[PDB]
Amino acid sequence: MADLKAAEVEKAREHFEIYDWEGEGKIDARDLGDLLRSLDCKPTLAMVKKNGGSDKRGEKKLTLEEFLPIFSQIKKEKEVGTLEDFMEGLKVYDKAENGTMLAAELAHVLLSLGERLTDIECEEIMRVCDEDDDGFLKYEPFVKTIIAGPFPDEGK
Amino acid sequence: MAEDPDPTEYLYISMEQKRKDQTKPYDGKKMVWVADEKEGYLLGLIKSTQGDICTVDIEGQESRQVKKDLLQQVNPPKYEKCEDMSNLTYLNDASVLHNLKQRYYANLIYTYSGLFCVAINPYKRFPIYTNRTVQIYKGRRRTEVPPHLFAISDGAYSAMLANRENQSMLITGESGAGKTENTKKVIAYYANVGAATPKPGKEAPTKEKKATLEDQVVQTNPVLEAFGNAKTVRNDNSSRFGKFIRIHFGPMGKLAGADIETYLLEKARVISQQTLERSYHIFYQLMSGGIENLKADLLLSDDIYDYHFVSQGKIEIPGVDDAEELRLTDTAFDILGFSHEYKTDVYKITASCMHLGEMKFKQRPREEQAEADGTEEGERVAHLLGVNAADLYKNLVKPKIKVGNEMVTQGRNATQVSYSVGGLAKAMFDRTFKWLVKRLNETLDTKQKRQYFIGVLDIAGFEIFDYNGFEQLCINFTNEKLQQFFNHHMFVLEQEEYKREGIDWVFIDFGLDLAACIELIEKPMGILSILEEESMFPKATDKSFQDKLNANHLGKSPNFVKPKPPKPGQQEAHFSIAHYAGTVPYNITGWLEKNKDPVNDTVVDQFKKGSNKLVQEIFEDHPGLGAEEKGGGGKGGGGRKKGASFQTVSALYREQLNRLMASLHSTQPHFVRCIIPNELKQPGVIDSGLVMHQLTCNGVLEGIRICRKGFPNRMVYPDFKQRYTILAASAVPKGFVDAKKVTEAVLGAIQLDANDYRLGNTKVFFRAGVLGRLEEMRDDRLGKIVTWLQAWIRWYLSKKEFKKLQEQRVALLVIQRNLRKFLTLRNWLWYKLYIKVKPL
Amino acid sequence: GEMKFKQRPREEQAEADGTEEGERVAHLLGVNAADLYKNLVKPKIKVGNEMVTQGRNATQVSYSVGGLAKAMFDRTFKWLVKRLNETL
Amino acid sequence: ESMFPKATDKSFQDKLNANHLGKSPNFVKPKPPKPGQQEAHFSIAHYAGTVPYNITGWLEKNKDPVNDTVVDQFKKGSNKLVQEIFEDHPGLGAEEKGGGGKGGGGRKKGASFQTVSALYREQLNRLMASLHSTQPHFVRCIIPNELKQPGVIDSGLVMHQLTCNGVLEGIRICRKGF
């Protein structure tokens, strides 16, 4: 993605009836982000505030009309599946590039810098990649695993 | 520190670039100075600038216009306060030193000098030595962070991981400025990455914490500084021993071990003392510190002078009092796990070295030979070794030089009477220096030998004083071999590869270079070939040692000045020999009287071995007076009654220097330059005129001039295509753009294709700080690790669960009709009835 | 093949006055004509473990162009069988 | 030792003469030209003739005429899809750095200057031994003629190939061949 498609509107009319528990419409604020995430747009909490949307509970809620300019700002900017500062944002403890970094410095740097998420996910970036006893764990496959995705396309 | 968060305030002063930058404007304080050829700096104006040459007018002195390979002068303000100072417009070591002069008072003693960096220090602690400021510059490479020894080692961690060679940090320079102190800063950088760093906590002690045990490698250095540095004629201490620690890093770069190869610790040096200074105050660490009680138990009493009145000087400490090494070494032994019982035994053999010698606290009124104040005779020499002779004192007072069973009495000035006792104490103090190798490596190594590993030398420098003989030979010749690598790798080998790569930048050499011209066994500097040939058989005629030196003609750089024989041929008077710097004076007798090693001018018979078990193990290899018995090689053995090495000790050391040279062609050397603070001593006085003279004779100024046109460090082109993660990765193309073309855009290519880097075939030649700037952009995007990727984490979770919610879209439409039917069928009942007990 | 004895300078180093010859290599790799024509001419020889060069003349230079090809062809083929073996 | 200038062509032949020669018969001995670097010839048993070898240049090829590094950076990508096609990521286009080691690639280690032939001792054991224990069907492929054409066969070629392929013995058991 890099522009709105006609099917992402046709997807969003369907998924409108999910968000309001009645089968009507009115996008919940955390389920604001779940709609953008099921349409290939996965901003940060600081990019959400730039588009003017939401991704968490307690933030502004909108209707589906109001969702289209918010959705369109992410398309112009990063995070629609673009590469820059993902597996380009990792490694600085190694001045070698073997496509590896240290195991210890690949699970407590996402916890000591970053927006900071779960210790289980800190354990998935270590699990997707190869293991050797030389202390060399790859960083670059866990990201491509995300490119593969549950659905590379528009979720359902 | 250089960046401290507000919640990390419990033990550390905050530093913030939020709002203020720690004074929002940066500003200058420099002037234009020109280097004197006496003392200090004096004002001067630029007359004309015709490129990199700069003709100067000293205001109230003289005018120059000569070459800048012998003219050194402080750059404009703009070209002070810069890193990798060899990239400037005016190529001066004087701008590095001046920038370092202001900064020494402000306790910041590193300022770059291209590849290398210059240093001025008292050989003591300052608060810049903290581990806190090491983690800040952690992964910042060469440039990006304020100049320091930790970022040299980082610049070298990365150029090691970017050249596809091994690396070897070494310390070049003239002693006066901390070499042993600077070693600690190399070993402590590898201690940090070798145990890794997640970056400064949001906590500091409350709550006492912060421990790592990689520090114990670092503490290896102050133990050896005690048995190596003391007051000399340059600042508070100077190095006068050779340290060569080969610290092993693993196949990651993680620190685990270190191999201490001890060179030579001075073979004199209690028996004689320098004039108005001291020569070595490290035998006096139990004369003003240590265990004072085991000073009187060994039978040594010196009568204090009770303040100067003239009978000494000779004895005269101008710096902070003896036993200044005693505090450094005692704290450092406990970190290493170096036993309390093991330090006691060092200090014994050191007061054994005092019983033959001493001159403290003033000269005897008829000796004219080493002895103590209180008239203790040679009875205290005999208490620990059991020596006897009817020539044991009061016949050593008269100089005698023993060649065989004969007594050839030739030469001998009055300050030089102390070879007649010799000889064992010299052989006991160097061997004590090697005792330290058997204990400290027991705890340091956990594995040994493997790549990477760094060859780190900390050797001697330039010293003046009449009394010098065999003592500084295998100390100074090590600096001379390293001086020659600095002038080989930069000028001769460096331009040979720019003629073997079809490079039209051939031969750019600026004089005073040595390129293995002293690696010959028979032309090193002239004296050392002669020591080694006549320490093999009974011979202690210094006339022949002076005669073969007076048939040796070497020179093209400082490394030989003509001798003055004790009688025949040329006169008496103090001759000299050059190493790399000025004139270094030397005595007529005492070369083979400091290596054949007299006892009391009676041939050894069992007197070469002690009477104590502890004095006995000290003796291993070293000739004794008289005949020698076969065997002794390397540095091993267990001593013999007559002689203890049939071979010279120094020729066993020659085997290590032929090998150290071949291992620096097996390494990419990054140097740490130490330049003399001043030759008048006392810290907090830097007279740049005296420094300027040392910056001309060793050839450091030509060394600035060469780092601009030519380049020492040698890397490869594909390292910009791999090492990075920003100028690499998907972010910047690797492999789809020329590997030369990346380097050329951030740094430019506007006559920087031979003024920034030499462009070769499969290899580029960088300063090894050219890499720090390139990496400076890289860490900017890498700053947060990683806020972009945590949003993708939440991508696949919300959309996978949204499946449970997507089948709920039709289900919501069923419960809404059903809730209406909950009340409709309650007005229209008799529409239910199902199994229970009520049906009919 | 057809490259030898490129000491003609463009940048004060061994490269070549060729263009088309090396452009038809260059484009297929990504790297430009200059990356190519610099790195051909002589290998960085580990001597000790540091990097030196030899003088190399026409045949020597020829043989070193052929190096770049044989390293590629060996390494591609070696990846190549093993990833096809999986499916079998 | 060849990736370093410590490699002598002398010792090569000496270690040949122990391990290959003693129970080999059609092996043509090394006669070395003592000056400098060999243009020495030897040959080793096979069904086919004597080979005049040239020994030099073997040197340069495992100090590599074009290095590890230079190749390795065409391997590297810009979407990482490129990388999978040639490597997963340890070695073959991505490098651990440093000098030293045998083999690679960039395991082990860095610009090693390739010695994949040593790695091929290891694996070579693994192919050879299982195949040793398997019960024989055999085909001994003989050169009929050089032009490789039906109805042309040379006597001289086949005469030579069969004397080295021990044809007497080879019918003594197989006189009952099935």
JSON list of C-alpha atoms in Angstrom, two decimals, chain B residues 464-619:
[
{"chain": "B", "resi": 464, "resn": "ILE", "atom": "CA", "xyz": [69.03, 13.11, 30.40]},
{"chain": "B", "resi": 465, "resn": "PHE", "atom": "CA", "xyz": [71.68, 12.47, 33.05]},
{"chain": "B", "resi": 466, "resn": "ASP", "atom": "CA", "xyz": [75.24, 11.37, 33.09]},
{"chain": "B", "resi": 467, "resn": "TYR", "atom": "CA", "xyz": [74.52, 8.01, 34.60]},
{"chain": "B", "resi": 468, "resn": "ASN", "atom": "CA", "xyz": [72.96, 5.65, 32.21]},
{"chain": "B", "resi": 469, "resn": "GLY", "atom": "CA", "xyz": [74.68, 2.34, 31.17]},
{"chain": "B", "resi": 470, "resn": "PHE", "atom": "CA", "xyz": [73.02, -1.00, 30.71]},
{"chain": "B", "resi": 471, "resn": "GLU", "atom": "CA", "xyz": [69.71, -0.35, 32.13]},
{"chain": "B", "resi": 472, "resn": "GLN", "atom": "CA", "xyz": [67.51, 1.66, 29.51]},
{"chain": "B", "resi": 473, "resn": "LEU", "atom": "CA", "xyz": [68.90, -0.36, 26.58]},
{"chain": "B", "resi": 474, "resn": "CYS", "atom": "CA", "xyz": [66.17, -2.91, 25.98]},
{"chain": "B", "resi": 475, "resn": "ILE", "atom": "CA", "xyz": [63.52, -0.40, 27.15]},
{"chain": "B", "resi": 476, "resn": "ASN", "atom": "CA", "xyz": [64.56, 2.43, 24.75]},
{"chain": "B", "resi": 477, "resn": "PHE", "atom": "CA", "xyz": [65.30, 0.12, 21.91]},
{"chain": "B", "resi": 478, "resn": "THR", "atom": "CA", "xyz": [61.66, -1.05, 22.12]},
{"chain": "B", "resi": 479, "resn": "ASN", "atom": "CA", "xyz": [60.45, 2.53, 21.73]},
{"chain": "B", "resi": 480, "resn": "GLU", "atom": "CA", "xyz": [63.00, 2.84, 18.94]},
{"chain": "B", "resi": 481, "resn": "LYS", "atom": "CA", "xyz": [61.55, -0.13, 17.11]},
{"chain": "B", "resi": 482, "resn": "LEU", "atom": "CA", "xyz": [58.01, 1.23, 17.63]},
{"chain": "B", "resi": 483, "resn": "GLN", "atom": "CA", "xyz": [59.17, 4.78, 16.57]},
{"chain": "B", "resi": 484, "resn": "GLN", "atom": "CA", "xyz": [60.48, 3.07, 13.49]},
{"chain": "B", "resi": 485, "resn": "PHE", "atom": "CA", "xyz": [57.04, 1.30, 12.90]},
{"chain": "B", "resi": 486, "resn": "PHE", "atom": "CA", "xyz": [55.33, 4.77, 13.17]},
{"chain": "B", "resi": 487, "resn": "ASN", "atom": "CA", "xyz": [57.78, 6.01, 10.65]},
{"chain": "B", "resi": 488, "resn": "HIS", "atom": "CA", "xyz": [57.58, 2.81, 8.39]},
{"chain": "B", "resi": 489, "resn": "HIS", "atom": "CA", "xyz": [53.82, 2.24, 8.27]},
{"chain": "B", "resi": 490, "resn": "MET", "atom": "CA", "xyz": [53.15, 5.91, 7.60]},
{"chain": "B", "resi": 491, "resn": "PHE", "atom": "CA", "xyz": [56.02, 6.65, 5.16]},
{"chain": "B", "resi": 492, "resn": "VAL", "atom": "CA", "xyz": [57.86, 3.70, 3.65]},
{"chain": "B", "resi": 493, "resn": "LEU", "atom": "CA", "xyz": [55.47, 0.66, 3.55]},
{"chain": "B", "resi": 494, "resn": "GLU", "atom": "CA", "xyz": [52.67, 3.08, 3.08]},
{"chain": "B", "resi": 495, "resn": "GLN", "atom": "CA", "xyz": [54.04, 4.60, -0.16]},
{"chain": "B", "resi": 496, "resn": "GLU", "atom": "CA", "xyz": [55.31, 1.11, -1.39]},
{"chain": "B", "resi": 497, "resn": "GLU", "atom": "CA", "xyz": [51.70, -0.01, -1.65]},
{"chain": "B", "resi": 498, "resn": "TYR", "atom": "CA", "xyz": [50.96, 3.17, -3.55]},
{"chain": "B", "resi": 499, "resn": "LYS", "atom": "CA", "xyz": [53.22, 1.98, -6.41]},
{"chain": "B", "resi": 500, "resn": "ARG", "atom": "CA", "xyz": [52.01, -1.66, -6.16]},
{"chain": "B", "resi": 501, "resn": "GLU", "atom": "CA", "xyz": [48.42, -0.61, -6.70]},
{"chain": "B", "resi": 502, "resn": "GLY", "atom": "CA", "xyz": [49.12, 1.60, -9.74]},
{"chain": "B", "resi": 503, "resn": "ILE", "atom": "CA", "xyz": [48.60, 4.64, -7.59]},
{"chain": "B", "resi": 504, "resn": "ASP", "atom": "CA", "xyz": [49.88, 7.98, -8.88]},
{"chain": "B", "resi": 505, "resn": "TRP", "atom": "CA", "xyz": [50.55, 9.34, -5.41]},
{"chain": "B", "resi": 506, "resn": "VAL", "atom": "CA", "xyz": [54.00, 7.74, -5.26]},
{"chain": "B", "resi": 507, "resn": "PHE", "atom": "CA", "xyz": [56.66, 8.66, -2.70]},
{"chain": "B", "resi": 508, "resn": "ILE", "atom": "CA", "xyz": [55.57, 11.45, -0.38]},
{"chain": "B", "resi": 509, "resn": "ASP", "atom": "CA", "xyz": [58.20, 11.15, 2.29]},
{"chain": "B", "resi": 510, "resn": "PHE", "atom": "CA", "xyz": [59.26, 13.77, 4.74]},
{"chain": "B", "resi": 511, "resn": "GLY", "atom": "CA", "xyz": [62.57, 13.06, 6.40]},
{"chain": "B", "resi": 512, "resn": "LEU", "atom": "CA", "xyz": [63.77, 11.42, 9.56]},
{"chain": "B", "resi": 513, "resn": "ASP", "atom": "CA", "xyz": [62.34, 8.06, 8.92]},
{"chain": "B", "resi": 514, "resn": "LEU", "atom": "CA", "xyz": [63.49, 4.72, 9.94]},
{"chain": "B", "resi": 515, "resn": "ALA", "atom": "CA", "xyz": [62.09, 1.64, 8.15]},
{"chain": "B", "resi": 516, "resn": "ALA", "atom": "CA", "xyz": [63.83, -1.39, 9.75]},
{"chain": "B", "resi": 517, "resn": "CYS", "atom": "CA", "xyz": [67.08, 0.31, 9.61]},
{"chain": "B", "resi": 518, "resn": "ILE", "atom": "CA", "xyz": [67.75, -0.47, 13.18]},
{"chain": "B", "resi": 519, "resn": "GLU", "atom": "CA", "xyz": [66.27, -3.96, 13.03]},
{"chain": "B", "resi": 520, "resn": "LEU", "atom": "CA", "xyz": [69.68, -5.19, 12.06]},
{"chain": "B", "resi": 521, "resn": "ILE", "atom": "CA", "xyz": [71.40, -7.06, 14.94]},
{"chain": "B", "resi": 522, "resn": "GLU", "atom": "CA", "xyz": [74.65, -5.36, 14.21]},
{"chain": "B", "resi": 523, "resn": "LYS", "atom": "CA", "xyz": [73.36, -1.73, 13.76]},
{"chain": "B", "resi": 524, "resn": "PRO", "atom": "CA", "xyz": [70.56, -1.24, 16.35]},
{"chain": "B", "resi": 525, "resn": "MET", "atom": "CA", "xyz": [72.10, 1.90, 17.86]},
{"chain": "B", "resi": 526, "resn": "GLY", "atom": "CA", "xyz": [75.63, 0.41, 18.25]},
{"chain": "B", "resi": 527, "resn": "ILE", "atom": "CA", "xyz": [75.90, -0.22, 22.09]},
{"chain": "B", "resi": 528, "resn": "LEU", "atom": "CA", "xyz": [73.38, -3.20, 22.26]},
{"chain": "B", "resi": 529, "resn": "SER", "atom": "CA", "xyz": [75.23, -5.31, 19.68]},
{"chain": "B", "resi": 530, "resn": "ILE", "atom": "CA", "xyz": [78.35, -5.00, 21.74]},
{"chain": "B", "resi": 531, "resn": "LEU", "atom": "CA", "xyz": [76.67, -5.87, 25.14]},
{"chain": "B", "resi": 532, "resn": "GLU", "atom": "CA", "xyz": [75.25, -9.01, 23.66]},
{"chain": "B", "resi": 533, "resn": "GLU", "atom": "CA", "xyz": [78.52, -10.32, 22.14]},
{"chain": "B", "resi": 534, "resn": "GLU", "atom": "CA", "xyz": [80.69, -9.71, 25.27]},
{"chain": "B", "resi": 535, "resn": "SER", "atom": "CA", "xyz": [78.16, -11.15, 27.86]},
{"chain": "B", "resi": 536, "resn": "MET", "atom": "CA", "xyz": [78.90, -14.64, 26.83]},
{"chain": "B", "resi": 537, "resn": "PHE", "atom": "CA", "xyz": [82.34, -15.18, 28.19]},
{"chain": "B", "resi": 538, "resn": "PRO", "atom": "CA", "xyz": [84.32, -13.42, 31.03]},
{"chain": "B", "resi": 539, "resn": "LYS", "atom": "CA", "xyz": [84.89, -9.90, 29.65]},
{"chain": "B", "resi": 540, "resn": "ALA", "atom": "CA", "xyz": [84.24, -6.70, 31.41]},
{"chain": "B", "resi": 541, "resn": "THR", "atom": "CA", "xyz": [86.75, -4.48, 29.70]},
{"chain": "B", "resi": 542, "resn": "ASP", "atom": "CA", "xyz": [84.73, -1.37, 28.68]},
{"chain": "B", "resi": 543, "resn": "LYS", "atom": "CA", "xyz": [87.61, -0.18, 26.59]},
{"chain": "B", "resi": 544, "resn": "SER", "atom": "CA", "xyz": [86.85, -2.89, 23.98]},
{"chain": "B", "resi": 545, "resn": "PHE", "atom": "CA", "xyz": [83.12, -2.03, 24.34]},
{"chain": "B", "resi": 546, "resn": "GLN", "atom": "CA", "xyz": [83.89, 1.57, 23.46]},
{"chain": "B", "resi": 547, "resn": "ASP", "atom": "CA", "xyz": [86.36, 0.45, 20.79]},
{"chain": "B", "resi": 548, "resn": "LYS", "atom": "CA", "xyz": [83.85, -1.59, 18.73]},
{"chain": "B", "resi": 549, "resn": "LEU", "atom": "CA", "xyz": [81.27, 1.29, 19.25]},
{"chain": "B", "resi": 550, "resn": "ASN", "atom": "CA", "xyz": [84.13, 3.55, 17.82]},
{"chain": "B", "resi": 551, "resn": "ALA", "atom": "CA", "xyz": [84.18, 1.30, 14.65]},
{"chain": "B", "resi": 552, "resn": "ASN", "atom": "CA", "xyz": [80.34, 1.49, 14.20]},
{"chain": "B", "resi": 553, "resn": "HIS", "atom": "CA", "xyz": [78.97, 4.31, 11.87]},
{"chain": "B", "resi": 554, "resn": "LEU", "atom": "CA", "xyz": [75.10, 4.33, 11.77]},
{"chain": "B", "resi": 555, "resn": "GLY", "atom": "CA", "xyz": [72.91, 7.32, 11.24]},
{"chain": "B", "resi": 556, "resn": "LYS", "atom": "CA", "xyz": [70.36, 9.03, 9.10]},
{"chain": "B", "resi": 557, "resn": "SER", "atom": "CA", "xyz": [68.01, 9.78, 11.92]},
{"chain": "B", "resi": 558, "resn": "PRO", "atom": "CA", "xyz": [68.78, 10.08, 15.69]},
{"chain": "B", "resi": 559, "resn": "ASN", "atom": "CA", "xyz": [70.02, 6.55, 16.63]},
{"chain": "B", "resi": 560, "resn": "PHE", "atom": "CA", "xyz": [73.81, 6.99, 17.21]},
{"chain": "B", "resi": 561, "resn": "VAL", "atom": "CA", "xyz": [76.24, 9.88, 18.21]},
{"chain": "B", "resi": 562, "resn": "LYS", "atom": "CA", "xyz": [80.02, 9.22, 18.48]},
{"chain": "B", "resi": 563, "resn": "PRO", "atom": "CA", "xyz": [81.48, 7.68, 21.67]},
{"chain": "B", "resi": 564, "resn": "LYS", "atom": "CA", "xyz": [84.26, 8.76, 24.06]},
{"chain": "B", "resi": 565, "resn": "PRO", "atom": "CA", "xyz": [86.56, 5.90, 25.12]},
{"chain": "B", "resi": 566, "resn": "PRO", "atom": "CA", "xyz": [88.00, 5.65, 28.76]},
{"chain": "B", "resi": 567, "resn": "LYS", "atom": "CA", "xyz": [91.55, 6.13, 27.43]},
{"chain": "B", "resi": 568, "resn": "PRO", "atom": "CA", "xyz": [92.78, 5.43, 23.94]},
{"chain": "B", "resi": 569, "resn": "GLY", "atom": "CA", "xyz": [91.62, 7.31, 20.85]},
{"chain": "B", "resi": 570, "resn": "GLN", "atom": "CA", "xyz": [89.04, 10.11, 21.61]},
{"chain": "B", "resi": 571, "resn": "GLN", "atom": "CA", "xyz": [89.03, 11.79, 25.02]},
{"chain": "B", "resi": 572, "resn": "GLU", "atom": "CA", "xyz": [87.09, 11.29, 28.08]},
{"chain": "B", "resi": 573, "resn": "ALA", "atom": "CA", "xyz": [84.01, 13.12, 28.88]},
{"chain": "B", "resi": 574, "resn": "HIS", "atom": "CA", "xyz": [80.38, 12.10, 28.64]},
{"chain": "B", "resi": 575, "resn": "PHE", "atom": "CA", "xyz": [79.50, 10.83, 25.24]},
{"chain": "B", "resi": 576, "resn": "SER", "atom": "CA", "xyz": [76.05, 10.07, 24.17]},
{"chain": "B", "resi": 577, "resn": "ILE", "atom": "CA", "xyz": [73.93, 7.95, 21.89]},
{"chain": "B", "resi": 578, "resn": "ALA", "atom": "CA", "xyz": [70.72, 8.96, 20.22]},
{"chain": "B", "resi": 579, "resn": "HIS", "atom": "CA", "xyz": [67.64, 6.81, 20.12]},
{"chain": "B", "resi": 580, "resn": "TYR", "atom": "CA", "xyz": [64.91, 9.13, 18.53]},
{"chain": "B", "resi": 581, "resn": "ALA", "atom": "CA", "xyz": [65.44, 12.25, 20.50]},
{"chain": "B", "resi": 582, "resn": "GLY", "atom": "CA", "xyz": [68.35, 14.71, 21.19]},
{"chain": "B", "resi": 583, "resn": "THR", "atom": "CA", "xyz": [71.54, 13.55, 23.04]},
{"chain": "B", "resi": 584, "resn": "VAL", "atom": "CA", "xyz": [71.12, 10.83, 25.80]},
{"chain": "B", "resi": 585, "resn": "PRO", "atom": "CA", "xyz": [74.32, 10.83, 27.88]},
{"chain": "B", "resi": 586, "resn": "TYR", "atom": "CA", "xyz": [76.21, 7.71, 29.06]},
{"chain": "B", "resi": 587, "resn": "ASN", "atom": "CA", "xyz": [79.11, 6.56, 31.29]},
{"chain": "B", "resi": 588, "resn": "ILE", "atom": "CA", "xyz": [82.51, 5.20, 30.03]},
{"chain": "B", "resi": 589, "resn": "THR", "atom": "CA", "xyz": [82.57, 2.07, 32.22]},
{"chain": "B", "resi": 590, "resn": "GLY", "atom": "CA", "xyz": [79.42, 0.15, 33.07]},
{"chain": "B", "resi": 591, "resn": "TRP", "atom": "CA", "xyz": [77.93, -1.92, 30.32]},
{"chain": "B", "resi": 592, "resn": "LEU", "atom": "CA", "xyz": [79.58, -5.15, 31.23]},
{"chain": "B", "resi": 593, "resn": "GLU", "atom": "CA", "xyz": [79.72, -4.38, 34.86]},
{"chain": "B", "resi": 594, "resn": "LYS", "atom": "CA", "xyz": [75.91, -4.22, 34.88]},
{"chain": "B", "resi": 595, "resn": "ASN", "atom": "CA", "xyz": [75.51, -7.56, 33.12]},
{"chain": "B", "resi": 596, "resn": "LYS", "atom": "CA", "xyz": [78.55, -9.59, 34.20]},
{"chain": "B", "resi": 597, "resn": "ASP", "atom": "CA", "xyz": [77.25, -8.55, 37.49]},
{"chain": "B", "resi": 598, "resn": "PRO", "atom": "CA", "xyz": [79.85, -8.20, 40.35]},
{"chain": "B", "resi": 599, "resn": "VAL", "atom": "CA", "xyz": [79.22, -9.42, 43.91]},
{"chain": "B", "resi": 600, "resn": "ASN", "atom": "CA", "xyz": [82.15, -7.94, 45.73]},
{"chain": "B", "resi": 601, "resn": "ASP", "atom": "CA", "xyz": [84.95, -8.44, 43.08]},
{"chain": "B", "resi": 602, "resn": "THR", "atom": "CA", "xyz": [85.53, -11.98, 44.08]},
{"chain": "B", "resi": 603, "resn": "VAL", "atom": "CA", "xyz": [84.27, -14.60, 41.61]},
{"chain": "B", "resi": 604, "resn": "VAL", "atom": "CA", "xyz": [81.05, -16.30, 42.55]},
{"chain": "B", "resi": 605, "resn": "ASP", "atom": "CA", "xyz": [81.26, -19.79, 43.81]},
{"chain": "B", "resi": 606, "resn": "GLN", "atom": "CA", "xyz": [77.74, -20.35, 45.23]},
{"chain": "B", "resi": 607, "resn": "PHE", "atom": "CA", "xyz": [77.26, -16.62, 45.95]},
{"chain": "B", "resi": 608, "resn": "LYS", "atom": "CA", "xyz": [75.08, -16.33, 42.78]},
{"chain": "B", "resi": 609, "resn": "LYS", "atom": "CA", "xyz": [72.45, -18.22, 44.69]},
{"chain": "B", "resi": 610, "resn": "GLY", "atom": "CA", "xyz": [70.93, -16.82, 47.90]},
{"chain": "B", "resi": 611, "resn": "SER", "atom": "CA", "xyz": [70.91, -18.16, 51.45]},
{"chain": "B", "resi": 612, "resn": "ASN", "atom": "CA", "xyz": [67.12, -17.84, 51.56]},
{"chain": "B", "resi": 613, "resn": "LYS", "atom": "CA", "xyz": [64.79, -19.95, 49.51]},
{"chain": "B", "resi": 614, "resn": "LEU", "atom": "CA", "xyz": [63.03, -16.87, 48.38]},
{"chain": "B", "resi": 615, "resn": "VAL", "atom": "CA", "xyz": [66.14, -15.01, 47.16]},
{"chain": "B", "resi": 616, "resn": "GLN", "atom": "CA", "xyz": [67.20, -18.30, 45.51]},
{"chain": "B", "resi": 617, "resn": "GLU", "atom": "CA", "xyz": [64.18, -18.61, 43.15]},
{"chain": "B", "resi": 618, "resn": "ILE", "atom": "CA", "xyz": [64.78, -15.07, 41.90]},
{"chain": "B", "resi": 619, "resn": "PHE", "atom": "CA", "xyz": [67.98, -16.03, 40.23]}
]
